[PDB]
Amino acid sequence: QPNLYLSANAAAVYSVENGEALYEQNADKVMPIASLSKLMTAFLVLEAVDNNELSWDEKLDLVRLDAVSLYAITQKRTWSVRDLYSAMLTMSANDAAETLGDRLDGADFPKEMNNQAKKLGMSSKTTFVSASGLDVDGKSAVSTTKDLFLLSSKLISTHPEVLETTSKPTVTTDKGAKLESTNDLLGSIQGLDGLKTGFTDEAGYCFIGTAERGGKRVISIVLDAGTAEKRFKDTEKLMEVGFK
């Protein structure tokens, strides 16, 4: 049970095969999660396509934010559902995430996120507030590492194709737009193919990682590391523990 000396305030790594913790630090602590919220949006986008309620080719106009935004970078407002989903997962474009949630359930999308959270076994310490994880009316999206593990594991087992997108260091859209991934560990740790970064002043630097080697998948959670690099340094330590 050796200490890792992590930057993160809360961190953990779990085996997917049995859901068991291999390392835990403040695993029950309620923590701001910010852009990690986009994994729930991704889950609900994928449920919508499967349920014949959403088309990958439907074109949508980016909602305007009050943040990293797809519109500002490109000056293009109209995007397919596919590209909005890629932008949300790769570059963490808030306006992309909010456009997807609004198409799915309008104003009622946070209620749908928390409905789904309870459905996937996440504890009542989890609260989503928005499709992007941006604060809403001063309230913040919060969760625990244990709850984030359950979300991620359910997302990967229910929709394994999420990793087809999260494993790409660059997603190039059909019309040539190159969306650069925030996951700098891709191509560095063997088997790593996800999952999602986040950062606010309050949440610090966060990252949910996942890797698989020889049938064994692990999911790592890093919350409130001190720099953009340190959340990845913590992930390397956790990923070493996960495959020991």
- Nearest distance from C-beta of residue 148 to ligand AIX, angstroms: 13
Task: Identify the CA nearest to 242 among candidates 208, 211, 214, 215.
Answer: 211
Angle at the Cα of 185 from the Cα atoms of 181 and 186, rounded to 5 degrees: 60
Residue nearest to ligand AIX (CB): 35
212, containing H or E segment = strand 204-213
**Cα–Cα distance measured from residue 108 to residue 220, given in angstroms and rounded to the nearest whole number:** 30
**Cα–Cα distance measured from residue 128 to residue 130, given in angstroms and rounded to the nearest whole number:** 6
**Beta carbon nearer to ligand AIX, 16 or 210:** 210
**Beta carbon nearer to ligand AIX, 16 or 100:** 100
Q: Is 50 annotated as a binding residue?
A: yes
Grouping H, G, I as helix, E, B as strand and the rest as coil, residue 79 is: strand
**Beta carbon nearer to ligand AIX, 16 or 97:** 97
Residues that bind ligand AIX (CB under 6 A): 34-35, 67-68, 92, 94, 133, 182, 197-200
Catalytic residue ranges: 35, 38, 92
CA atoms within 13 A on the CB side of 230: 16
- Nearest distance from C-beta of residue 35 to ligand AIX, angstroms: 2
- Nearest distance from C-beta of residue 132 to ligand AIX, angstroms: 7
Q: Is 47 annotated as a binding residue?
A: yes
Q: Is 20 annotated as a binding residue?
A: no
**Beta carbon nearer to ligand AIX, 28 or 67:** 67
The DSSP output letter for 36 is G
Q: Is 24 annotated as a binding residue?
A: no
Q: Is 17 annotated as a binding residue?
A: no
Measured torsion, CA atoms of residues 213, 204, 97, 159, in degrees rounded to the nearest 10: 20
Beta strands in 49-117 (DSSP E): 59-61, 78-80
- Nearest distance from C-beta of residue 201 to ligand AIX, angstroms: 8
**Cα–Cα distance measured from residue 26 to residue 204, given in angstroms and rounded to the nearest whole number:** 15
Q: Which residues are annotated as part of the binding site for substrate?
A: 196
